[PDB]
Amino acid sequence: LEEALEAKEELERTNKMLKAEMEDLVSSKDDVGKNVHELEKSKRTLEQ
Amino acid sequence: LEEALEAKEELERTNKMLKAEMEDLVSSKDDVGKNVHELEKSKRTLEQ
């Protein structure tokens, strides 16, 4: 039961991850502007 | 244990559903080539 619950909790973290991915994908589908370069830059510096 | 396993199986059905949603979204994005959504994905994965 402990093993099954840990597996379920891991699966819930992956589920939530995929939900966030889906939400951000539809948000990115809804509109495209110069913002994409600013968020690219802000993360590209964060690579350092 | 039976209840926990059924909950895990339901969570797996939702996981598979979100995976199918993600796949269909990327398939729809392939209609207009990678340009900003690749950068926004890179932002999310880098932040993770």
Helix intervals (H) in chain A: 2-30, 35-46
Backbone torsions φ then ψ of B44, nearest 5 degrees: -70, -40
Which residues does chain A have within 8 Å of residue B26's beta carbon, measured at their own beta carbons?
A: 25
CB contact under 8 A, A39 and B40: yes
List the resolution, Å: 6.3
Choose from A40, A41, A45 for mutation: most chain B CBs within 10 A.
Answer: A40
**CB nearest A40 (choices: B26, B43, B47):** B43
The token duo for A33 is 């502007």
DSSP B32: S
Amino acid at B38: E
Asked if the C-beta of A14 comes within 8 angstroms of chain B's C-beta atoms, the answer is: yes
Q: What is the DSSP string of A3-14?
A: HHHHHHHHHHHH
CA-CA distance, B46 to B48, in Å (whole number)? 5
